[PDB]
Structure formats: structure tokens, C-alpha cells
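Changelog entry: the C-X-C motif chemokine 13 record was regenerated in this release. Current contents:
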Amino acid sequence: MVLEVYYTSLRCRCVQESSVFIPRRFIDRIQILPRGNGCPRKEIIVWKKNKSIVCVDPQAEWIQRMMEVLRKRSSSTLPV
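Regenerated C-alpha cells:
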């Protein structure tokens, strides 16, 4: 899996947000676009293994919990 963070100032890419759980095993990439002057909200786009591309609510509990896993394994992926 690949996490991409775009430190850009472009217009919003998402017109809706989904809060539906996406199991990590189905995720090929996650793209995070922090908000800025181009888009007034943080966007999180999940690229699923079946090629679906899903804008996700960045305040959804399941994505927050996932992001904590990704943060804590960003220097070592060893499960300790």
C-alpha cells in the first residue's frame, strides 16, 4: 500500500464524501490532500483494488484509526 500526501493548492477534487468502512486489504493507495487556499477542506481519496476511487470523510472514525496505524509504522513496518 502507498500513502500519497499532496502539498498542493489546487481546487477540491471531491464532490461528496463517503463514511463507509473500507477494509485495509482492499486499499491500493490512499491520497491525502490537506486543505489550503484552493480547497477549504481536507480530502482523502482511497484507491480500491477493484479500481473504485472513493472520496472518504476525513472525520470518519475508521479512517482516523487507520491513519494512526500508518503514522506509527511510517519508519518501521515491524508490528511492535
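The helical segments are 61-72.
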